[PDB]
Design a protein around this ligand. Structure first.
Ligand SMILES: Cc1cc2nc3c(=O)[nH]c(=O)nc-3n(C[C@H](O)[C@H](O)[C@H](O)COP(=O)(O)OP(=O)(O)OC[C@H]3O[C@@H](n4cnc5c(N)ncnc54)[C@H](O)[C@@H]3O)c2cc1C
Ligand SMILES: Cc1cc2nc3c(=O)[nH]c(=O)nc-3n(C[C@H](O)[C@H](O)[C@H](O)COP(=O)(O)OP(=O)(O)OC[C@H]3O[C@@H](n4cnc5c(N)ncnc54)[C@H](O)[C@@H]3O)c2cc1C
Ligand SMILES: [Cl-]
Ligand SMILES: [Cl-]
Ligand SMILES: [Cl-]
Ligand SMILES: [Cl-]
Ligand SMILES: [Cl-]
Lengths: 519, 519
């Protein structure tokens, strides 16, 4: 079933806009009909084939083409969904919230404008992948690391703008951003920070520049199209020691989170702390069929086999030490002593692991910024599928951690899915992350998934736990949880949207923000 | 001599507003006539007495009184100048850009709403001083440090919003901000981040919340009135070692900046690096008259007597080590060895300083977040004066440091002032900071000051060095240096200003931002 037209746009307006788009980028860089397939969400949730359907895609080569495209979108009221590389799998891929939206795919704007070793930064266009930035650095022998999600075909820009995370000390991608160029919804171009100063050499050295700090308003946003972005890069460290701490009991997560709190608040653990459930970690190297025959989620007897077999606990804390050995030894003493008295705890460094293909060896690559695509193998746990996550924010306490594990594993298993969870800590923020793998081809699984997801959001919100990043299908739902003072915050986002984008042509419904023409 | 009415506002409109303000906050907290004196800039620059003249001040007790004052302001078209404590000495104090603006003084809103030890944060109203928050922490025995901008009587909120800086690893005050409550220009109230979720306990734990990141637009801004603000607080570390490294030769600053760069990018130096000129450091414990009776800048023979008398160099680098001894020793080895081979270099710890009142003993207090008013001593160098500062951003290069030292020291000395200066480094950002001490009572000195200041701006901008914070007199002048693409960035600020504040009643001219009614 073909995408419907966006409401308020005629066949003739759409036909005219797509031909005008083709005059700007070339007929070969406007995609309709059979060539739209890759812009669909690969992990379908809806059973309604009229939802989240991109009408076409346009793939520009430059900021100047983006500006022209934006002006044509305003001329015809044809809305655009900007993507850097459009690999936002688990969140909708390249697909828009509103059917009939045209994808603006900036994949071909893939110039690495600068990599600066002595100041540790890069200035990149949206099409630059983590693979590409990593290869450039390696090729040029620069003593810099990148910070990669578990998945390396993504965008250094796109991932950061969606408040993406990785597994080095530079793991908060948007916090490491510094300077951007934006095409505003009127088609005019602006630079933030020191980029506003002609002849500056400081665009990537100082975030604020002068006056209001606005870079943030173009993250998780439909206020602009980002065409260049700076990012800080970690200088190669004097040493690197990745580790795995395993815990034998499901209830250990309570005391583990209590012990993690001071180590994370003080910065003794130098990267994000990630504590993964047994099945989430097993799914890298194993399938359910190799330990259990049921079509249901696993029983506890299986869990015990997997633990001894894979040298994993019910909870698996991956982290890493960075810097000269005397620093790494001192921090390690602090971290190890924090967990040594827990019955059944085990400590591993890479040389301590007895398997060739191993969770610590796999996570050790990500914790030093090596981009890969091996993480997608976890989707084969239950025969093959898509994934979606729920990652709300809570205080770093044992009580909050065990409450979420209990609430979520209960609900997920009620709907026929194995519980795959982790407790993640950035700095002062805990996230219980629910990872759900589903057969996206099965209408009944899709219906169960949607119904489950809505229960997780509601029960989390009732405890004061709010989502920070979500799939196109739930962007309205998450926005409505942020309801303080009768939705005061979204009223302010709406005022800013109407000011910058009076015709509502950028990404209708992104982050639950809709302009005056569609509200 | 009395302040003029703001243009467009009648005596009747003003008198009605003031009558309504008195009923909102009480007659004892609307200040007119003789009681306006404290709201004048204490360090006058302009010789035109009709400039930067507040008409009156209102001191509300609560967010509800702020909302009512803002609605009254919209009713009568009376503009407001929001200050948290108005201690912005060197930037115009509590005085507005535009004469006849009424000061909205929130010093009486001084509740410490929360200090959380296990998560290391505070939630504060704008009237909370560094002195008050430090005294609160000390009395309850909480193992937390604050970060002070050497001006104990200032606002935790107000300083952060103006992008203020201190001397611990938490020195970027606005970077450590997390959650705020803002009264918007229509008098409606909003909470950013996790504060938009009813029942959250995460407002001070996670900056972003969901959707666009907007806290930044209320910093160095007239988009809103901040009434509550969270800030991250450093856990008391396992150890603290403040140090002073002196350089004999003014030309040493070139090689010193070169060696500082990798140490700062990599985080081996854990706080801001501050490299202060002889006179700036000497003026802390001595006056010019102790060494030289002439009215001109000191000569070189006097500089050398001062260096020998005080154990100071032409350049004085104060920094501190934080954390467990084995970490501090490792970082000290790298820092020490970076400078050991410079002829004339000297290394001091507190126990190495002979003088009882001593640069390093005062700086050691600031670099562990002990609030003081010691820093004001440099105003007595030439018998008593005010100060203004020029603090543009540059790359951390010897060539940029020595260029700025030569082009500024020559000009300031040319106009008859002693050069007092420093090279400060945040993380990747160099600042050559010019401190100009002048007789604020003397119209001739004021005129030489204004002339010198304008030359320093133009010569800096010609090199691509832009200011990040300035005095109310120069806010339009600095805005105009950020002129990339025919002033694109300020056209965007103006679009947001007109959307949030259609009647232009918040702080007209803050950061060179004027609404449509005044532009
Ligand atoms: C197995 C697996 C593992 C994953 N691991 C991680 C992980 O560790 N960490 C993580 O963060 N994510 C992870 N993800 C989620 C996701 O796949 C990645 O974050 C991915 O990199 C995002 O796609 P992208 O980088 O191509 O960004 P894009 O798809 O290009 O951008 C994402 C969104 O940002 C906005 N946007 C992008 N570019 C612009 C622009 N120029 N202007 C304006 N708005 C723009 C749009 O709303 C767009 O839809 C994982 C997913 C899976 C399935
Ligand atoms: C000798 C000397 C040393 C100094 N040392 C330092 C230093 O080391 N570091 C440093 O950073 N500064 C320094 N200063 C500058 C200044 O004195 C301090 O930064 C001081 O703390 C700022 O005043 P305040 O905290 O009362 O802020 P305020 O005066 O209350 O606020 C400053 C500005 O921010 C805005 N603002 C404040 N509150 C709000 C609000 N609630 N809503 C909206 N806008 C608001 C307004 O535009 C206001 O004018 C120094 C000054 C002198 C003379
Ligand atoms: Cl460029
Ligand atoms: Cl819209
Ligand atoms: Cl409160
Ligand atoms: Cl510590
Ligand atoms: Cl205005």
């Amino acid at each position: 079933m073909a995408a419907p037209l966006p409401e308020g746009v005629s066949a003739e307006a759409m036909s005219s806009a797509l031909d005008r788009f083709a005059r700007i980028v070339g007929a070969d860089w406007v995609f309709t009909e059979d060539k739209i397939t890759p812009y669909e969400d690969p992990y379908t949730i809806s059973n309604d084939e009229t939802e989240h359907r991109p009408y076409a895609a346009v793939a520009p080569a430059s900021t100047e083409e983006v500006q022209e495209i934006v002006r044509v979108a305003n001329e015809f009221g044809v809305p655009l969904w900007p993507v850097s590389r459009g690999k936002n799998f688990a969140y909708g891929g390249a697909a828009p919230v509103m059917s009939g939206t045209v994808v603006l795919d900036m994949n071909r704007m893939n110039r690495i404008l600068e990599v600066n070793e002595e100041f540790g930064y890069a200035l990149v266009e949206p099409g630059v992948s983590y693979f590409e930035l990593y290869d450039y650095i390696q090729e040029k022998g620069l003593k810099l690391w990148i910070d990669v999600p578990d998945v390396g075909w993504g965008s250094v820009v796109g991932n950061a703008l969606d408040h993406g995370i990785g597994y080095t000390p530079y793991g908060d991608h948007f916090a490491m951003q510094c300077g951007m160029e934006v095409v505003l919804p009127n088609g005019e171009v602006v630079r933030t920070g020191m980029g506003a100063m002609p002849g500056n050499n400081t665009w990537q050295l100082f975030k604020y520049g002068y006056g209001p700090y606005v870079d943030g308003i173009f993250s998780q946003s439909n206020f602009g199209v980002v065409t260049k972005m700076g990012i800080w890069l970690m200088p190669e460290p004097a040493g690197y020691r990745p580790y795995l701490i395993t815990f034998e009991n499901e209830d250990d997560i309570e005391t583990v989170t209590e012990r993690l709190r001071p180590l994370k608040v003080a910065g003794v653990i130098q990267n994000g702390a990630t504590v993964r459930s047994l099945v989430l970690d097993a799914a890298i190297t194993r399938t359910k069929s190799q330990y259990y025959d049921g079509d249901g989620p696993i029983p506890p007897s299986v869990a015990k086999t997997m633990m001894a077999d894979l040298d994993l606990g019910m909870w698996n804390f991956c982290g890493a030490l960075y810097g000269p050995p005397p620093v790494m030894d001192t921090l390690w003493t602090a971290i190890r002593d924090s967990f040594a008295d827990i019955p059944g705890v085990k400590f591993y460094f890479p040389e301590d692991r007895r398997h060739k293909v191993d969770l610590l060896l796999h996570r050790a690559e990500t914790m030093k910024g090596v981009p890969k695509l091996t993480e997608f193998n976890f989707l084969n746990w239950d025969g093959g599928g898509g994934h979606v996550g729920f990652s709300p924010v809570s205080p770093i306490t044992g009580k909050d951690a065990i409450k979420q594990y209990n609430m979520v594993s209960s609900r997920v298993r009620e709907y026929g899915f194995d519980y795959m969870g982790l407790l993640a800590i950035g700095w002062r923020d805990l996230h219980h992350v629910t990872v759900i793998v589903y057969d996206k081809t099965d209408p009944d699984e899709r219906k169960k998934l949607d119904e489950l997801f809505n229960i997780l959001v509601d029960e989390a919100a009732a405890e004061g736990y709010g989502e920070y990043r979500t799939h196109i299908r739930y962007m309205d739902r998450i926005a409505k949880t942020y309801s303080w003072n009768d939705n005061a915050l979204w009223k302010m986002h709406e005022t800013i949207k109407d000011a910058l984008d009076p015709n509502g042509i950028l990404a209708p419904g992104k982050s639950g923000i809709w302009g005056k023409n569609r509200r």
